[PDB]
Amino acid sequence: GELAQALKELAKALKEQAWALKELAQALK
Amino acid sequence: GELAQALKELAKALKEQAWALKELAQALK
Amino acid sequence: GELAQALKELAKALKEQAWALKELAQALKG
Amino acid sequence: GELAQALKELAKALKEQAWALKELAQALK
Amino acid sequence: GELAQALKELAKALKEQAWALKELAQALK
Amino acid sequence: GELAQALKELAKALKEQAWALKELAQALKG
């Protein structure tokens, strides 16, 4: 229903999370 | 959706955490 | 039901943790 | 059912999370 | 429980994250 | 259903983040 873009906005968050992690990993070298 | 409500709060918290990770990464360089 | 309530709490923990990381980041600058 | 101690083991995790945060906050002074 | 399965994976990840936060705290002192 | 799948992914992100924090902690020691 409208728990449907619940999951959509969470999927975006998870993606932002991944980009952020990648940047930190790269800083740790 | 109530449950949906929670998932929206989670997504927003996740984004903020991701942005904090980026600030950490930049402080390292 | 109680699952909803649990996920809200995870959300607050992540938010509080974000704040702490900003502080750490600032300390690492100087 | 046996999503019942699902939530129980998650409640414990959340508590560990809080203790960990408190210790970091205290280190940041 | 499958959904229950996920919640168990989450709890374990949360614990590991909490323990990493403590290691961070101790490194500061 | 798809909620289950989503929560699994959060779990992996938290696990990967934990590793990164251990590395940061080690770097802060020296």
Numbering used by the authors:
A (entry chain C), B (entry chain B), D (entry chain C), E (entry chain B): 1 to 29
C (entry chain A), F (entry chain A): 1 to 30
Authors' own words:
Here, we describe variants with all combinations of the aliphatic residues, Ile, Leu and Val, at a and d to give four classes of peptide: the ββ class, with a and d = Ile or Val; Lβ, a = Leu and d = Ile or Val; βL, a = Ile or Val and d = Leu; and LL, a = d = Leu. In summary, solution-phase data and X-ray crystal structures demonstrate conclusively that different classes of Type-2 coiled-coil (CC) peptides—i.e., based on abcdefg repeats with predominantly hydrophobic residues at a, d, e and g—adopt a range of distinct states.
Specifically, we mutated the centremost Leu at d (position 17) to Glu to give CC-Type2-IL-Sg-L17E and CC-Type2-LL-L17E. However, unlike the parents, they had accessible thermal unfolding transitions. Both transitions were pH dependent with stabilities increasing sharply below pH 6–7.
